[PDB]
């Protein structure tokens, strides 16, 4: 039903004016909500890990992928509410947070390309869908074209995505040159013994992984995440991560991988010690993505990782989405707005935040202790259930390096708190205009999932016991 949305939408956007664009996104927001509500019941198809293959050995549908599908729709309902709703009714925030005409077009085409990977069985479905989502990230980066940094970032992202698309294509055709086959379904655990498919499947994994931000090739993605504006970057950070990783976690082609294990160690090291002496908030906030994409590369080495993965996915997605939404709200309280596309940059700009909207600091605290892994919060059971899979399966040096990486990464997480709970000379006493009710309810909902979401751990596991076993 994304197809019908795109086909209806681009015809509808061709006829609307510029001033209509905002309200169009509101429509699409509600549309996606009634694809969650009125169409969820398809989970009843997937009892006892019954898997389907649709369109003839082409798309594989299990309930792992159904959950990834539902997660991607939920986060788009959020991101679409960020574009489609005003923050305040000022003359300021209309020229700072304003959608383009064709923005929601590229959004839905991107989600289409990201779903056709997690649902994918074939390799040409994999390649066409990676190409579709890669074009969409090209154009979502370059759509705010009256910005020097965003155009430079779109060009950088074009060439570095072109190399790692031709590396994937070379790995697919290298796999074809030794097996007249397109599926990893053909592998079926006898062939891997008598066939040297190490170097092929590992090179395929790498060419898929370097697009995430794994650490030998991590600098260019941190540059794109700092150069893009503040609304584009909470989408292009989240979507290729969860799409490409839930591809590679579903098909288990790097087990006992020594190369994935080196790159997981190297990722947890230079992500935690990378973002220490840094002063820009999107930088600081983009090396948090490097370490938390490091905790996934561990699970690639695993067999049977579908609990640790999915729980830590929706953990990172809610925590991610919430900490980006908080520093949208701190823009009213800063004393200095530069750079219209990216209005808050330096992390010392949110300094007096406890004396002006103290419960924004309560919100910020609750989400940032969840990144560290504090046990009343939902981030801790995510790190816990990763640890239960790492220690089960023989990765003992990986585990202590995970722990040292978590301890180093707590420093620049707590730097946000250190800066936020400080004295400020000039405090706000009263504000005329207040924040959007339907948009601040989303942040309150995203906290109450993080705070009081350890409640349902038991229920989820029992539901997890039925539909995946």
């Amino acid at each position: 039903m994304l197809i019908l949305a795109i086909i209806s939408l681009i015809t509808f956007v061709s006829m609307s004016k510029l001033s209509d664009n905002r309200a169009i996104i509101r429509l699409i927001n509600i549309y996606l909500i009634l694809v969650l509500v009125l169409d969820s019941f398809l989970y009843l198809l997937f009892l006892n890990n019954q898997t389907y293959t649709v369109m003839g050995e082409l798309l594989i549908f299990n309930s792992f992928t159904f959950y990834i599908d539902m997660l991607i729709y939920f986060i788009m309902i959020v991101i679409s509410s960020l574009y489609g709703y005003n923050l305040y009714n000022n003359n300021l925030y209309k020229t700072l947070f304003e959608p383009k005409k064709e923005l929601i077009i590229l959004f839905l085409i991107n989600i289409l390309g990201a779903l056709l990977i997690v649902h994918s069985n074939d390799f040409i479905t994999l390649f066409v869908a990676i190409e579709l989502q890669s074009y969409s990230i090209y154009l979502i980066t370059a759509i705010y074209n009256s910005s020097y940094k965003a155009s430079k970032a779109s060009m950088l992202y074009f060439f570095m995505g072109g190399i790692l698309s031709i590396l994937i294509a070379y790995s697919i055709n290298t796999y074809y040159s030794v097996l007249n086959s397109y599926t990893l379904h053909s592998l079926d655990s006898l062939i891997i013994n008598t066939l040297d498919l190490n170097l092929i499947l590992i090179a395929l994994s790498l060419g898929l992984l370097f697009k995430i931000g794994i650490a030998p090739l991590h600098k260019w993605l941190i540059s794109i995440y700092e150069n893009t504006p503040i609304l584009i970057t909470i989408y292009i950070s989240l979507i290729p991560k969860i799409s490409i990783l839930s591809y590679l976690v579903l098909s288990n082609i790097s087990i006992n991988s020594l190369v994935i294990s080196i790159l997981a160690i190297l990722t947890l090291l230079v992500g935690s010690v990378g973002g220490l002496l840094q002063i820009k908030i999107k930088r600081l906030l983009a090396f948090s993505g490097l370490t938390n994409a490091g905790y996934m590369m561990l699970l690639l080495l695993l067999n049977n990782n579908e609990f640790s993965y999915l729980y830590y996915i929706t953990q990172y997605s809610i925590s991610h989405l919430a900490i980006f939404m908080i520093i949208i709200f701190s823009i009213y309280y800063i004393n200095y707005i530069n750079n219209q596309y990216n209005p808050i940059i330096y992390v010392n700009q949110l300094k007096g935040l406890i004396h002006d909207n103290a419960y924004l600091v309560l919100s910020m605290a609750i989400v940032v202790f969840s990144f560290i892994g504090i046990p009343p919060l939902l981030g801790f059971f995510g790190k816990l259930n990763i640890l239960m899979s790492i220690l089960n399966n023989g990765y003992y040096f990986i585990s202590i390096v995970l722990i040292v990486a978590s301890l180093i990464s707590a420093l620049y997480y707590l730097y946000l708190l250190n800066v936020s709970i400080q004295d400020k000379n000039n405090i706000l006493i009263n504000s005329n205009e207040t924040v959007s009710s339907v948009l601040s309810y989303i942040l309150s909902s995203l906290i109450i999932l993080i705070t009081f979401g350890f409640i349902y751990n038991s229920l989820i596991i029992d539901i997890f016991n039925v539909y995946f076993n």
Binding site: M55, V128, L132, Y135, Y138
Partner: protein
């Protein structure tokens, strides 16, 4: 120039490596060069119509992989919408 020469040697040899499946690394490379045997082409009279190659592509793009043609239509659509949407400057 020195990283050029090192990468020429390594990337060339290692591109020639994965066409082969001995566990020993030197036996992987030499199987790249043992091609001088001439394949024998035999005439089989089993085919009755001039299905060319383009006919078979049009049968497999359209029945077995029709969805790939249709997702490909979405990609061609994107290749229209994108360059336009950048280079408009609406109003």
């Amino acid at each position: 120039l020195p990283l050029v020469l090192i990468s020429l040697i390594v990337l060339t040899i290692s591109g020639l490596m994965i066409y082969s499946n001995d566990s020993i690394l030197i036996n992987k490379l030499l199987e790249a060069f043992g091609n001088d045997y001439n394949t024998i082409i035999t005439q089989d009279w089993f085919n009755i119509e001039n299905t060319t190659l383009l006919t078979t592509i049009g049968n497999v793009l359209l029945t077995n992989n029709a969805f790939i043609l249709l997702v490909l239509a979405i990609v061609l659509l994107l290749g229209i919408i994108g360059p336009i949407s950048i280079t408009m400057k609406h109003k």
